[PDB]
């Protein structure tokens, strides 16, 4: 007795485009592949896919992978759930252009997985049952990168350039449990037109919480991500990137971020989060305000 499922998927506008989407479904217990589907947009670029799939009922693990080169071919070498999990765990080198931007034809890798979903009997090919992953209405894809958003609220006349340093070389389609093994060279951020906003992107990067700025065991402070501001005077400022919700201990971002206080930050950069800096460039110093939010 079958199930017809209506799958609605979307990213959680080059940053939002989903050019291809693979769905692979496995029996949660046996690991058998029980359904798969591939979608692509000839163009110009959609952010959502809606489609119907037929499968047998039971307990199912759903895997969604977007914007992976030749994912359709890859699906044939994913025979069972064990293969599928290995595939999700691969360290993949981020396309060089993606530290700067997604493009019209090359979107950010995205994924999502939902385990042990109860798929019940029913639906028809014309009237399918809506797929409700973990009770939600939509499949919500997570980008594998974070967005770095640097805004010069004052003193942009003094700015020569901004670079993202120690970015992870690799992304992973499921969250990282270990620090990066390899690091990308410096990325000069891209100015949004003639505004005072600079952008870049980088893969998720785990940093052990036993480390802090100036105490990583590494002269370059790897694996801590930071951005470097260079002024026309040739002054340089390094701003470590952290993940911190709520009020900053001591009220000043830089001393906290630089590991100068008893409380140390988390330096992990998480996928699909938005790191926003508001910077004032004064003659002899900078001031930095910070927030982290969803993308």
UniProtKB/Swiss-Prot annotation:
Top-level taxonomy: Bacteria, Pseudomonadati, Bacteroidota, Bacteroidia, Bacteroidales
UniProt function note: Tip subunit of the minor fimbriae. These filamentous pili are attached to the cell surface; they mediate biofilm formation, adhesion onto host cells and onto other bacteria that are part of the oral microbiome. They play an important role in invasion of periodontal tissues and are recognized as major virulence factors. Fimbrium subunits from different strains have highly divergent sequences, and this correlates with pathogenicity.
Localization (cell): Fimbrium; Cell outer membrane
Record protein name field: Minor fimbrium tip subunit Mfa3
Assembly and oligomerization: Component of the fimbrium tip. Minor fimbriae are composed of a structural subunit, most often Mfa1, and the accessory subunits Mfa3, Mfa4 and Mfa5. Fimbrium assembly occurs by linear, head-to-tail oligomerization of fimbrial subunits. This is mediated via insertion of a C-terminal beta-strand from one subunit into a groove in the N-terminal domain of the following subunit. Mfa3 is required for Mfa4 and Mfa5 insertion into the fimbrium.
Domain of life: Bacteria
Keyword terms of this UniProt record: Cell outer membrane, Fimbrium, Lipoprotein, Membrane, Palmitate, Signal, Virulence
Origin species: Porphyromonas gingivalis (strain ATCC 33277 / DSM 20709 / CIP 103683 / JCM 12257 / NCTC 11834 / 2561)
Remaining remarks: The name (minor fimbrium subunit) does not indicate the abundance of the protein, but is derived from the greater length of the major fimbriae. In strain ATCC 33277 and strain ATCC BAA-1703 / FDC 381, major fimbriae are 300 - 1600 nM in length and about 5 nm in diameter. In contrast, minor fimbriae are only about 80 - 120 nm long. This length difference is observed only in a small number of strains, including strain ATCC 33277 and strain ATCC BAA-1703 / FDC 381, and is due to a loss of function mutation in FimB, a protein that restricts fimbrial length in other strains.
Assigned GO CC terms: cell outer membrane; pilus; pilus tip
Family: Belongs to the bacteroidetes fimbrillin superfamily. FimB/Mfa2 family.
Inactivation phenotype: Mildly increased autoaggregation.
């Amino acid at each position: 007795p079958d199930v017809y499922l209506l799958v609605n998927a979307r990213a959680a506008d080059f940053e939002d485009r989903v050019h291809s989407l693979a769905m692979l479904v496995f029996d949660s217990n046996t690991g058998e592949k029980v359904a798969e589907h591939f979608s692509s947009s000839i163009g110009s670029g959609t952010s959502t896919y809606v489609f119907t799939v037929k499968l047998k009922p039971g307990q199912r693990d759903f895997f969604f992978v977007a914007n992976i080169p030749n994912m359709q071919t890859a699906m044939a070498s994913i025979v069972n759930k064990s293969d599928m999990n290995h595939f999700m765990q691969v360290f993949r080198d981020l396309d060089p252009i993606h530290y700067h931007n997604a493009t019209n034809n090359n979107g950010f890798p995205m994924s999502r997985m939902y385990s042990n979903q109860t798929v019940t009997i029913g639906g028809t090919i014309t009237q399918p049952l809506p797929f409700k992953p973990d009770g939600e209405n939509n499949v919500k894809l997570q980008r594998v990168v974070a967005k770095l958003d640097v805004n010069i609220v004052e003193g942009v006349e003094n700015l020569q350039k901004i670079e993202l340093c120690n970015a992870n070389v690799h992304y992973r389609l499921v969250p990282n449990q270990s620090e990066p093994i390899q690091f990308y060279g410096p990325v000069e951020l891209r100015r949004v037109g003639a505004t005072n906003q600079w952008l870049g992107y980088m893969p998720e990067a785990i940093v052990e919480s036993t480390k802090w700025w100036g105490n990583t065991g590494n002269a370059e402070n790897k694996p801590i991500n930071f951005f470097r501001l260079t002024t026309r005077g040739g002054l340089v400022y390094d701003v470590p990137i952290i993940t911190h919700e709520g009020a900053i201990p001591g009220g000043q971002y830089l001393p906290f971020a630089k590991g100068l206080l008893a409380d140390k930050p988390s330096y992990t950069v998480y996928r699909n989060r938005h790191y926003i800096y508001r910077i004032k460039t004064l003659p002899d110093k900078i001031e930095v305000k910070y927030s982290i939010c969803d993308w």
